[PDB]
């Protein structure tokens, strides 16, 4: 490659800006989500099929916060991967599995809420049907199957640049089989349509059918409009939180030029979004429990206690 106009570096002011933000979004994560698991586990009256589907989303959220956030905080400070050699083989796998649960569990509720509203004579009994347990097992299992390429695709090269011989935990440029060689060249577009676009399209579409059913007594008229707004409030939060992180990979693979003399500046620009994008991406793993405090009166009393 042609010599670059300037070095690739991050201003030290950025390190403290992200670190301060990362402290807050982390703390609200474990404590906030564990409470939602506490009430369900303690009281057996809370135990029912509709409610257990929420616990699946809450359980998977805890895995995402403990795995994705703490590792990325270290890498910004020491700029090393001294953890281990196989340890690199596991973070891209477990972290990719937790995201699959959150997206798919969000899709399960958006179908269940339509069944009851469209139901005429059905009384939703307080219990866990055997069919509901099938959905959780299928959702959890399929997630751990679609993250296989990340588990066996990474490695530790020992390349040298700028008179510095280091080690990196990246995807090996040359593979052996043909399945993973195609996976490299199309992973960026694969993540977009099966972890951001897929949940947004169906959950939004299903929720209009539910809203159209209700909108088609003065206190109750307020309730129907209140829930309709709350339904689209959580979807909009979901769309905005994941927007920057996905766009970072796209601009890397679309506009970047290998022979660009000032590719160093554009590259350094690309690190500004990824580090902050993870922090707002993790915000969706925290938004759900507050959205339950402002809606469910029964959950409001439990939250106070």
């Amino acid at each position: 490659p042609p010599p670059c106009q300037g070095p690739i570096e991050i201003k030290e002011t950025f390190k403290y800006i992200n670190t301060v933000v990362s402290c807050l979004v982390f703390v609200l994560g474990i404590i906030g989500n564990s409470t939602l698991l506490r009430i369900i586990y303690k009281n057996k009256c809370m135990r029912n099929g509709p409610n257990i589907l929420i616990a699946s989303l809450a359980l998977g959220d805890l895995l995402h916060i403990v795995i994705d956030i703490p590792i990325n905080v270290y890498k910004l400070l020491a700029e090393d991967w001294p953890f281990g050699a196989e340890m690199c083989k596991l973070v891209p796998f477990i972290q990719k599995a937790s995201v699959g649960i959150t997206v798919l569990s969000l899709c399960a509720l958006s179908i269940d809420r339509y069944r009851a509203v469209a139901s005429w004579s059905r009384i939703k009994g307080i219990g866990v049907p055997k069919w509901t347990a099938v959905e959780i097992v299928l959702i959890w299992v399929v997630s751990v199957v679609l993250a296989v390429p990340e588990a066996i695709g990474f490695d530790i090269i020992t390349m040298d640049y700028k008179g510095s011989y280091l080690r990196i935990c990246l995807l090996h440029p040359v593979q052996k089989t043909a399945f993973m060689q195609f996976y490299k060249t199309a992973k960026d577009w694969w993540l977009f349509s099966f972890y951001f676009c897929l949940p947004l399209a169906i959950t939004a579409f299903f929720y209009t059918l539910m809203t159209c059913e209700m909108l088609r007594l003065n206190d109750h008229l307020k309730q129907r409009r209140e829930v309709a707004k709350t339904v689209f409030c959580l979807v909009l939060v979901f769309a905005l939180c994941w927007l920057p992180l996905h766009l970072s990979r796209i601009l890397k693979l679309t506009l970047y030029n290998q022979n660009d003399p000032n590719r160093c500046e554009l590259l350094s620009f690309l690190l500004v979004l990824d580090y902050i994008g993870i922090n707002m991406a993790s915000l969706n793993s925290c938004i759900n429990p507050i959205a339950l405090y402002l809606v469910s009166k029964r959950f409001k009393n439990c939250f106070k206690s």
Partner: peptide, 21 residues
């Protein structure tokens, strides 16, 4: 992340200083 080859050391350094995702 990943790069086309190990000869393009700039992309390799960029992936050295980036997130793991």
């Amino acid at each position: 992340c990943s790069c086309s080859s190990l000869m393009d050391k700039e992309c390799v350094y960029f992936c050295h200083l980036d997130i793991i995702w």
